[PDB]
């Protein structure tokens, strides 16, 4: 028992939320190039045998509803769960097209006690989004 | 009784460190995502996930640097952030 059991009938779902266009009120400019990421991820996970589902430009409300519905599915025959978020963000926050939503709110649907069919199975969240406005000037090697 | 934390078995692979911006190339995609996909494609059939993500960290840290007409955003770097609450090793393959 040093490795996760990954021989279930299915590797699991890979949900990709690709937000590119946002409402003006947010002041976030179109995330050019995010479609390339979304397609790369889809193909990459497809080869790893995951059931990939791509969703584009979801509002903060739609993201929460999607995560809730997914977490309520029967993941019994799945080895794991993967979710990739591509959007603008801030520390602890991810942006729906119309506004911010706490990451904790999203991941909580999959808590060991709230999604029993995934208890003890690896739940991966891949997050491509800013976590503030600090810039790394780097150092010469 | 035989219980496990409700926060156990989660892995959050952040594209950048806490408080920092995350970089993206308008043409090729985000630094983190293109690196992650390349490393998964090259090593998923062998290496454990944390080691694959460590490779992603290095690729992002060494091969990318921003270029901007705005000196404020020019020549910047980025390091991803692996946050693991996993309790076991993860391999995307089976024997």
């Amino acid at each position: 028992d040093n490795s996760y059991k990954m021989d279930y009938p299915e590797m699991g779902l890979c949900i990709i939320i690709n937000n590119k266009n946002f409402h003006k009120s947010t002041g976030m400019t179109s995330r050019s190039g995010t479609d390339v990421d979304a397609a790369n991820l889809r193909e990459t996970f497809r080869n790893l045998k995951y059931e990939v589902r791509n969703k584009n430009d979801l509002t903060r409300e739609e993201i929460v509803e999607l995560m809730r519905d997914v977490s309520k599915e029967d993941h019994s025959k799945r080895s794991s769960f993967v979710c990739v978020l591509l959007s603008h963000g801030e520390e602890g926050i991810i942006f729906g097209t119309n506004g911010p939503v706490d990451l904790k709110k999203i991941t909580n649907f999959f808590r060991g006690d709230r999604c029993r069919s995934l208890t003890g199975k690896p739940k991966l969240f891949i997050i491509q989004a800013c976590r503030g406005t600090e810039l790394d000037c780097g150092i010469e090697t | 009784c035989h219980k496990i934390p409700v926060e156990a078995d989660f892995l959050y692979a952040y594209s950048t460190a806490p408080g920092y911006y995350s970089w993206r190339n308008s043409k090729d995609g985000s630094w983190f995502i293109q690196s992650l996909c390349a490393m998964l494609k090259q090593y998923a059939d062998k290496l454990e996930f944390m080691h694959i993500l460590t490779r992603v960290n290095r690729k992002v840290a060494t091969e990318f640097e921003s270029f901007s007409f705005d000196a404020t955003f020019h020549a910047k770097k980025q390091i991803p952030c692996i946050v693991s609450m996993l309790t076991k090793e993860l391999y995307f393959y089976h024997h």
Partner: peptide
Amino acid sequence: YVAX
């Protein structure tokens, strides 16, 4: 190059 764009920041997210």
